[PDB]
Amino acid sequence: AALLQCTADTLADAVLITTAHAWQHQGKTLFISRKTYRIDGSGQMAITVDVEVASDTPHPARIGLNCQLAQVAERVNWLGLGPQENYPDRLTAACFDRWDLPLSDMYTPYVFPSENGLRCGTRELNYGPHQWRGDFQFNISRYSQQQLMETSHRHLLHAEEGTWLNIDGFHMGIGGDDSWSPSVSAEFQLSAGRYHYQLVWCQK
Amino acid sequence: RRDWENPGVTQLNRLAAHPPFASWRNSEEARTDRPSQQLRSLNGEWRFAWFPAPEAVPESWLECDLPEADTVVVPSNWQMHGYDAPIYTNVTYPITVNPPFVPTENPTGCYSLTFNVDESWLQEGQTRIIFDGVNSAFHLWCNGRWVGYGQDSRLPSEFDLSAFLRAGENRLAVMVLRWSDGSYLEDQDMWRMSGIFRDVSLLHKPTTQISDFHVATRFNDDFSRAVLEAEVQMCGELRDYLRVTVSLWQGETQVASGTAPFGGEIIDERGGYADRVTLRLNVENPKLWSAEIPNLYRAVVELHTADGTLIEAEACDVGFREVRIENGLLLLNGKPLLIRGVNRHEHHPLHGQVMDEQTMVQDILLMKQNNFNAVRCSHYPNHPLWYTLCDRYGLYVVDEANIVTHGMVPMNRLTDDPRWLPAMSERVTRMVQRDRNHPSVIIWSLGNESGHGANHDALYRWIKSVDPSRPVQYEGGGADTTATDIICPMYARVDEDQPFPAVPKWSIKKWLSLPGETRPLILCEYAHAMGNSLGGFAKYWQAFRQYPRLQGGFVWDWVDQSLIKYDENGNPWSAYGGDFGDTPNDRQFCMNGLVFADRTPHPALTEAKHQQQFFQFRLSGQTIEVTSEYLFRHSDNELLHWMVALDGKPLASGEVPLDVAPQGKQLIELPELPQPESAGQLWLTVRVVQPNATAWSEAGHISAWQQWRLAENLSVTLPAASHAIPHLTTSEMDFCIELGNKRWQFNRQSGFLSQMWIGDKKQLLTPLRDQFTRAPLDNDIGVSEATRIDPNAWVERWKAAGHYQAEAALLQCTADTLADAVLITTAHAWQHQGKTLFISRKTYRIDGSGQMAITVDVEVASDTPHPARIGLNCQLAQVAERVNWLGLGPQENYPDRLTAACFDRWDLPLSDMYTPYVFPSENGLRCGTRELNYGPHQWRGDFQFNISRYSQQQLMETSHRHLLHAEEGTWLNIDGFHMGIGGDDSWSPSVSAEFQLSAGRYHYQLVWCQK
Ligand SMILES: [Mg+2]
Ligand SMILES: [Mg+2]
Ligand SMILES: [Mg+2]
Ligand SMILES: [Mg+2]
Ligand SMILES: [Mg+2]
Ligand code: NA
Ligand code: NA
Ligand code: NA
Ligand code: NA
C-alpha cells in the first residue's frame, strides 16, 4: 500500500475521512483503493470502498477488508446465506436466514488448509460488541490468511491471538470442474475493473 | 363460372413451366447471353381502369379501350398509383376467412395494351405471352377473344397467342382480381397489393422447339472430376434428322461438347421418351461454384438438324457444385456450410412490390458487404433476375414455394386438406421447373407458416423424387417434422426453451441432441430486427461456431417495409400499417429490417457484419492468431492493419499481409511496442482490409475487425492543490455554490441541481434528475396496444408498477463546507400508490478547481419489474454541433448489442447521435464511455449515454419519426446502467437475464467540469 491521499473533514454532525491507496509491484499499479469513513452522531462508522483493478493483471481472489480483532467471542451471529460455508459458485444449498453458530463451526478443517469458512449475501454480522452491515461475504476464524497459506496440514495450525475477520465486497469463485487447471467460470471472475461496496461498523 | 372462387381452377389454357427462355437463333448470342430478337419486352405504358367488382366491368372493354382509363407504367402495383388502399396485416387474412370464397366487393384492375406484331412472327412458329407476376388472379383476352386464366402471384403465366394475333396492331385485355382462392395461400407478413407487378414479354419459339432442359453436375470423391448431365426435351414433329448439341464454355474456351439424336433410354415396358435426350459431358478439374468464389460455366443447348441447321438455342449459367446432407451436416462441395443469411422480401418504398435491377443489385452489394452469404426467398418465388444475380455475385439461395396459410385456424387446415393439394402442388412444381437450373439455389422450401399437413409430405417427396440435388426444408408444424431435411425453427433462442404445447421452440443447442435426432439446424428465421433490436445476436454466433450441426440462420429481415406518403407541404415521410386508412392493421410490425426502405443501414447492420466475420482472432502476448472461416478460398485480397492507442491517442500502427488457407491459421507477430509514461489503457485494434476492388466491394473495404485491451496504467497522480475555495450561500429554498465564473444552484424543496452557470450564462432548462425509464423500444412493447394490453410485455410491467409516473419524494438535502470544497448530500424515494420503488442517494462534491464529483447509489425493490435504466437526465441550454467521446463507437450501441463497437476517441455531428427509427424510441446510446464532450461541458466516469434534440417523453409520445420536433436545447441522458434491448423475437420478453438490471443496489460516479 502506497498512500496517495488522507484527509479529514468536519460535517454538521459527522467526521469525514477520505483515503486513497495504490498497490504497486515492480513499478506497476495493481489495485487502487479509494475510501471514505463517515462516523456520525449515532456512533456508527459508514465505510465506502471504491476499487480499481488493472485490466492486465490477473483477476483478484477477493476485494475486501481485513483486520485482527482483539476480541475472542463464543458465538457468531449473521443474517445471510448459511448455515454452512458457501462461496459465489457454490451457494445454492445455503439459505438466507438468521444463523447463530459457535466460532469453530465458522472454520472448515480442510486437511490441507486454505481459504475457508466464507458465507455470502450477508447483510448483518455480529461478533462480541461489533456489528457490520451491508451486502458482503465474510469469514471469521482464529487463523490468518497468512498462517493458512504457510501451513500444509490442519493439525499444524495454532489459534492466533484474537480473531481474524475477512469482509469482502466481492470474492472469486472456487471452481472444481477439475483440480489441475483453472476451472473458475468467467462469470465468477473478478474482472469488472471497478468495484464498489459499502460497510457500516457499529456497536450493539 | 367464378373461377377465382374455385381451388379446382388454378389456370385455364396456361402453358407448361420451364427454365428461362430466349429462343436464340444464333448460338454465339446464346453463349454470350446477349439480348434475343425472339424475346420482346411489353413493359411500358398501358391503359388502366379500376372497378369495385368483376361484375362492374363494362362488356365493351373487351373490344374497345375505355375513355375513363388512365395511362400507367407496367409493371406496377395499382395501390402505388392510389387506386385503392394497400393493406398491412401480419397473421389475420385481409378478407373474411370463408374458403374458397372472397368478398363480392373485389377490387378489379383492368389493364390493356395496343401493341405491334411483326408479320415474321405470325408467318411461322409460335408466339406466346409471358406474365411474370400478376397479383393475385387474372383473365386474359386478346383482340376481344378469351385466351385463359391463371393464379399464383409469384410465378410466370404463359399463353399461346399465335391463333389470336394478326399483323401489326393487336390489343390485350387483362382483368386482374385483387382477391381469389389463391389469396388463401398468400398470407405472408407483408403489404397486400395487386396488379401486374412483374415483367410482361412476348416470346417467339419455333414449332419444333426446346420445351424443357435440366442441368445436373455430379462429382468424384475429391471433386477433381465431374460429369455434367443435361436432359433436353422437345415439342413438335419427331424426325430422324433432329439432334441436340450441349456445349460447355468457360469464357471463350469450350471445355466440353456432346451431340446425340433424340430418343432417351428405355424407361419401362412401353419403351422410353422418343421426344427426349440426355447429354453427358466429362469435365476434368472443374472450377467449383460457391458464394465465396462464384465460378460459372456457360452451357449452350442447340436444337438442330444433324446436317447443321440450328433450329433454336437456349442457354444458362452453370455452377459446378454439390449440395448434400451427410452425417447430420449440410455440405457444399464436401465442406460444412455456415449460413450467414437474411430473409428478403421484394419491397420498394416507392414502387411497392415491383422489383428492378438497380434495387436488386444494391441489395446484393450491401448484403455481401456486410458478410452475408445467403438469402431466403421469403415467402415466394422471386423475380427471375434475382437468381441470375445470386449466381454471378455469389449467394446461397433458399427458394420457397408461394404457400402461406398463417391465418387459418388451425394453421394446417388447408394443407392437411387433400382438396387443396392440386393448388399447392403447382406452387411447388412450377417453382422447381422454373429455377432448378440455377446454381445459387441450394435448398428448396415448401412455403412458410402453414402448419404441417399431409400435402406437405406428398410435396416434400415429390421434390426428393424429381430433384435429388437439393435438400427440402419446411418450418411449419414444429420445424422438425417429416416434411423437412433441416431443423429450421423461427425465433428459437440459443439457451432458453420456449416449450409451447405441440410446437415447442427448443433451445437450438438442446434441439440437435434430442433422442433420435440427427439432422442439421439452420433457423429459417431468427434475430427479429424490429426497431432498436439485434440484442443477443452474438449469443447465436458463438453457438453456431461451437456446434458443428448448428449451421447458421436467416435474419428477419432485410428491408423495412415502409411506404412513402406525402404531407400538406408535399414532403415525403415513411409510413406503415394503418397510414393508408387500412384496417385492421398490425401497425409498425411491417418494419423489421436491418436497412430502412431506402436501403440506409440501421445500426444493427454493423452488428451483423461483425458477427458474420470470415476471420476469427485470438491474442496471446504479442502474437495475433488469424483463423479463416472460408471453406474454399485463400485470403488472396486481404491484409491486416493493426493499431495500438492509449485512450484515443495513436501510439503505433502497421500492415501485415494476410496469407491464410481456407480453414487455416496465420500467426502474425507484432513488433515490440514501446509503452508510454502517461496513465491510461492501451487498446489494440485490428482490421482486415481488401486492397483490391471486387464485383461486390470497392478498394479499401473493411471485411473484419477486432479489439483487445493491452497494458493499463492506472493513474496514481492527484490534481494540484486548488487555487481557491468555493463559497456556499444558504436560503430556505436553495443551496448556492460560487467559484470563479462557475455557479451551482441546488433546490432544497426538490433536492436537485436546478441551474448551473459558466461565466454568466445559464446551462440548464430542466433540472438534473434521476431517470429509471426509457421511451419503450419495439421489443419493450411487443404486441401490447391500448385496446388489447399484453401484461407480460416489459412496457406494461413498467406502466403497471408505476415507473413512468412515480414522483420523487425528498428525504434528505444538506450542505457542508469542507476545507477545500462544498458537499451537497441528497436522498430521494420514488413511490407509486404507497409503494417505494427506488431510493437514490447522492453526494455532489465541488472543490476549488471547478469540478463537480457526483456519486450516485441507487436501491431498487426486488418485487418491482427491473427498471429500463438507472441514470440521470437534464435539458442543457446549449446546442452544439459536435459530440466528442472516449468510448464505444462510432455507431449506436447497447449492452446486449455492442460487440461491433470499438473503444476510441469518436467525433460526430449531433444529428448522427440520433437514430431515426420510423417508430421513435430510446435510441442512439453509446456504451462504455469514459469521457463525454459537448460544447463547454465534459463528463468523466464509466457510463452509457444518449444526446439529442428529443426528450424521452416526446419519443414515447410520438408514433412516427417525421412528427418529431426538435426541442429547445439538448436532452442529455447519462446512465450508470442500461437494460438490454432484446430481439430474439418482438412479441414476448426477450431481454436475456444477464442484461437485466436486477442487482438490487447500483453505484455510479460522474465528474462534471468545464473542459
Ligand atoms: Mg437455491
Ligand atoms: Mg380458382
Ligand atoms: Mg458450335
Ligand atoms: Mg389491427
Ligand atoms: Mg472480443
Ligand atoms: Na496451506
Ligand atoms: Na457450425
Ligand atoms: Na414482420
Ligand atoms: Na414512440
CB B467 within 8 A of CB B444: yes
Task: Measure the CA–CA gap between B61 and A20, rounded to whole angstroms.
Answer: 92
Q: Is A188 exposed, middle or buried (0-12, 13-18, 19+ CB in 10 A)?
A: middle
H or E segment at B457? helix B454-466
Helical (H) or strand (E) element with B665: strand B665-669
Q: What cell numbers appear for B723 in the block?
A: 487555487
**What are the CA-CA distances from residue B319 to residues B244, B291, B695 (Å)?**
21, 11, 17
Q: Report residues near ion ligand 6: CB below 5 Å.
A: A 113
Instruction: Give, as residue ranges, everything with CB less than 5 Å from ion ligand 1.
Output: A 92
SS3 assignment, position B368 = helix
Side-chain-side CA neighbours of B965 within 13 Å: the count stands at 3
Distance CA B953, CA B265 (A): 76
Cell reading at A185: 467460470
For residues B384, B147, B180, B104, the Cα torsion angle rounded to the nearest 10 degrees is 150
Instruction: Round to whole Å and give the CA distance between B533 and B556.
Output: 11
Q: Give the C-alpha separation, B511 to B377, whole Å.
A: 25
What are B114's three cell numbers? 395496343
Cell triple for A60 = 483478484
Cβ contact B624:B655 at 8 Å: no
Answer whether the bond into residue B776 is a cis peptide, omega within 30°. Answer: no
Other beta carbons within 10 Å of B768: 23
Closest among B130, B260, B149 to B198, alpha carbons compared:
B130
Strand A194-203 vs strand A130-141: parallel, antiparallel, or unpaired? antiparallel
CA distance readout (Å), B815 to A186, B121, B487, B824, B999: 43, 97, 65, 5, 30
Query: Strands, DSSP E only, in A103-203?
Result: 119-127, 130-141, 163-171, 194-203
Nearest to A56 among B710, B816, B819 (CB): B710
The residue assigned the cell 443551496 is B735
Cis ω for the linkage preceding B579 (within 30 of 0) = no
d(CA B246, CA B227): 13
Q: Does B1003 touch chain A (CB under 8 A)?
A: yes
The gap from C-alpha B143 to its chain's centroid, in whole angstroms, comes to 44
Peptide bond into B75 cis (omega under 30): yes
- Asked if the C-beta of A17 comes within 8 angstroms of chain B's C-beta atoms, the answer is no
Q: Is B449 a catalytic residue?
A: yes
Encode A87-97: b = buried (16+ Cβ within 10 Å), e = exposed. Answer: bbbbbeebeee
Torsion of CA A85, A89, A92, A97, to 10 degrees: 50
CA distance B656 to B883: 33
Within 10 A of A41 (CB to CB), how many other CB atoms are there? 8
Q: In this structure, what C-alpha cell is assigned to residue B248?
A: 460447355
- Active-site annotation holds for B525: yes
List chain A residues with CB under 8 Å of B716: 2, 4, 22, 24, 29, 32
The C-alpha angle with vertex B649 and arms to B643 and B650, in degrees rounded to 5, equals 30
Structure determined via: X-ray
* Residue ranges near ligand 9 (ion) with Cβ within 5 Å: B 920
Angstrom CA distances, B563 to B121, B357, B777, B916, stand at: 42, 19, 21, 15
DSSP B55: G
Q: Minimal CA–CA distance to A130: which of A54, A38, A200?
A: A200
Beta partners for residue B245, in sequence order: B259, B302
> Are the C-beta atoms of residues B303 and B313 closer than 8 Å to each other?
yes
Amino acid (one-letter) located at B22: A
Backbone angles phi, psi at B779, to 5 degrees: -70, -25
Helix, strand, or coil (residue B662): coil
Crossing angle of helices B604-611 and B537-546, in 10° steps, is: 10
Write down the residue that cell numbers 440462420 correspond to. B553
User: Ligand 1 centre from A194 Cα, in Å?
Assistant: 28
One-letter identity of residue B391 = D
Q: Following DSSP, what letter does each residue of B550-609 receive, concatenated?
A: EEEEEES-SB---EEEE-TT--EEEE-TTTTS--S--GGGG---SB-TTSPBPTHHHHHH
The number of C-alpha atoms within 13 Å of B909 and in the hemisphere containing its C-beta is 2
Q: What is the residue-wise DSSP string for B523-555?
A: EEEES---SS--TTHHHHHHHHHH-TTEEEEEE
What residues are paired with B657 via a beta bridge?
A: B639
**Which among B716, B823, B942 has the least Cβ separation from residue A22?**
B716
- Cα separation, B40 vs B416, in Å, equals 42
- Containing H/E element for B424? helix B421-435
Cβ atoms of B751 and B815 within 8 Å: the answer is: no
CA angle B961, B962, B963 (to 5 degrees): 90
Cα–Cα distance, B988 to B985 (Å, whole number): 7
> At B450, which amino acid appears?
S
Residue A131, helix vs strand vs coil: strand
Q: How far apart are CA B728 and CA B748, in angstroms?
A: 14
Max CA-CA distance within chain A? Answer: 57
Residue whose C-alpha is closest to residue B683's, from B705, B708, B659, B704: B708
Verify whether the Cβ–Cβ distance B709 to A55 is below 8 Å. yes
Q: What CA–CA distance (Å, rounded) separates B84 from B103?
A: 15
| Closest ligand to Cα B707 | 5
A13 touches chain B (CB under 8 A): no
B475, B456 Cβ separation under 8 angstroms = no
Strands B323-326 and B329-332: antiparallel
Q: Which of B788, B794, B754 is nearest to B775 (CA)?
A: B794
Q: How far apart are CA B880 and CA B932, in angstroms?
A: 13
CA distances from B24 to A76, B210, B248, B770 (A): 96, 11, 17, 74
Contact assessment for residue B106 and residue B54, using Cβ atoms and an 8 Å cutoff: yes
d(CA B771, CA B856): 12
B12 close to A (CB below 8 A): no
CB-side neighbour CA atoms (13 Å) of B782: 19
> What is d(CA B913, CA A152) in angstroms, rounded to the nearest whole number?
60
> Resolution of the coordinates in A?
2.7
User: Reduced to 3 states, what is the DSSP secondary structure of residue B666?
Assistant: strand
Distances (CA, A) of B414 to B94, B98, B236, B324: 17, 12, 39, 31
Q: Angle CA(B528)–CA(B954)–CA(B946) in degrees, nearest 5?
A: 65
Residue recorded with cell 424515494: B829
- Separation between Cα atoms, residue A55 and residue B709, nearest integer Å: 7
Q: How far is the CA of A93 from the centre of ligand 1 (A)?
A: 6
Output the CA–CA distances (angstroms, integers) from residue B58 to B55, B64, B67, B148, B301, in the order listed: 8, 10, 12, 19, 47
Residue pair B537/B323 in contact (Cβ under 8 Å)? The answer is: no
Determine whether the annotation assigns residue A132 to a binding site. Answer: no
d(Cα B778, Cα B915) in Å, to the nearest integer? 14
3-class state of residue B818 by DSSP: coil
Please judge whether B714 and A20 are an interchain contact, meaning their C-beta atoms are less than 8 angstroms apart: no
| CA of residue B342 to ligand 7 center, whole Å | 17
Contact between B896 and B995 (Cβ < 8 Å)? yes
Which of helix, strand or coil describes residue B795? helix
Which residue in B861, B925, B914 sits closest to B889, CA to CA?
Answer: B925
* Strand stretches in B320-430, DSSP E: 323-326, 329-332, 335-336, 339-343, 374-376, 396-400
Q: How large is the C-alpha radius of gyration of chain B? A: 33
Domains, chain A, ranges and CATH?
Answer: 1-204 (2.70.98.10)
Q: How many Å apart are CA B157 and CA B321, to the nearest integer?
A: 30
Kind and range of the H or E element at A146? helix A145-150
CA distances (Å), B180 to each of B17, B57, B598, B847, in order? 22, 17, 32, 77
Ligand 1 center–CA B771 separation, angstroms = 33
CA distances from B321 to B226, B246, B325, B650, B717 (A): 10, 19, 14, 47, 64
Please write down the HEC assignment for all residues of B124-139. CCEEEEEECCEECEEE
Catalytic member of B231, B525, B796, B892 = B525
Q: Is the dihedral of CA B342, B347, B350, B351 positive or negative?
A: positive
Tell me the DSSP string of A34-99. EEEEEEETTS-EEEEEEEEE-TTSPPPSEEEEEEEES---SEEEEEEEESS--BTTB-SS-EEEEE
Calpha distance B947→B956 (Å, rounded):
16
Q: Which of B314, B346, B449, B638 is catalytic?
A: B449
The SS3 assignment for B781 reads: helix
Q: Cell numbers at residue A23, please? A: 498497490
